[PDB]
Write a protein that binds this ligand. Sequence first.
Ligand SMILES: [Cl-]
Ligand SMILES: [Cl-]
Ligand SMILES: [Cl-]
Ligand SMILES: [Mg+2]
Ligand SMILES: [Mg+2]
Ligand code: NA
Lengths: 106, 101, 107, 107
Amino acid sequence: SHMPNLCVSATFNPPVITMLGSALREETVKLLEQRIPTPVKFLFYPNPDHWRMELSQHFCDDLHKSAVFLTIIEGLEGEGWNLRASNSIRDSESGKDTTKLFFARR
Amino acid sequence: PNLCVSATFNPPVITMLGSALREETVKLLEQRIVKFLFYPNPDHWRMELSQHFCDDLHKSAVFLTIIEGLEGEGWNLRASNSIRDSESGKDTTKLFFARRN
Amino acid sequence: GSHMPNLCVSATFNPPVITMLGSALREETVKLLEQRIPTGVKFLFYPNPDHWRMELSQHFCDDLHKSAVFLTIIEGLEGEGWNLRASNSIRDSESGKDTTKLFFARR
Amino acid sequence: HMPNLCVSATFNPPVITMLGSALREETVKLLEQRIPTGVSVKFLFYPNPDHWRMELSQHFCDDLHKSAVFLTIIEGLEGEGWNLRASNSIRDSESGKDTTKLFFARR
Ligand SMILES: [Cl-]
Ligand SMILES: [Cl-]
Ligand SMILES: [Cl-]
Ligand SMILES: [Mg+2]
Ligand SMILES: [Mg+2]
Ligand code: NA
């Protein structure tokens, strides 16, 4: 170990954001839960340990999805997490798209 | 500061989000890639090429011009992703940039 | 082999099938990942193209566990001197399977 | 002013296109030799936009061979001074074709 990474995954719609990473501190999660709506919360779950936020009453179009990704990337960069890679898929039957963002420590 | 550029085809619709994006950078891209129009909430620049059709090769050329234009302005490419929507027949690609500072 | 070797790790779901390509991938790295991935079974070697393959036949990874699998692979490989450079993913509507690729370069 | 390169690969049959004004023909020839070796043909030049295109009409690549093609391209380019920065991919359900893009920078 000693090489911590972070994965943020975002599925739409409705928006469901998950954050995974062994060195991810709750204080980082709390900073992002204030940025993303700009009083919805991230809930913690184990195996694998992660934080999950669902915006049940929200619908994001392409522009607002771009804004969500940007706020996450900017918030995490300020916390010492650098963006290294991303990927995305769209599921034709559910009509949902999922995007993953991978970060490394500097 | 970071920047997200999103490009949907077809017709081409290019959106650029990032508070630190200069209007001078936007103008350089306009000449490289009709104009980008500014809109608030969220603050962004949007260019729509209604009378244009870009095939796979021209989509690659559009991405390259955007990346090269932004690199010269101090924005480094960090990641990308893409999806194709089977019902609309449209594909959307995102390009993420970070400042070299 | 002018300037530094590379790796490609591909993962298809479901069931999870992980493939690792790259001539410079040492068997010691493959063993470390074998211990890591279930925590988040062995890799078998096949030629033409040379690669390591692991199947988890009795497993069904939801989206969260897919993210955990990618993270364990990235972290394991980073500790071994392999830096993540890019990723991509597709979903096949007819098979219902998604495939994600992770590309690494030497430090 | 900074040169970048985009390599796009569509399957099946495999069609590889390379765009980037600063791409040397020596680099094109190197990849021309590497790509068939990864799966075991030439790249043709076309204008508007200027690019190199290779076909393998008599070939059908499974997911493993697609990974091998991407890896050979990345490794070949890295030796030529091109660093991998990003990738993306889509699958078209009606044509049954998948397209992957690989972006490289000289820096
Ligand atoms: Cl992607
Ligand atoms: Cl990427
Ligand atoms: Cl897709
Ligand atoms: Mg994709
Ligand atoms: Mg990507
Ligand atoms: Na990258």
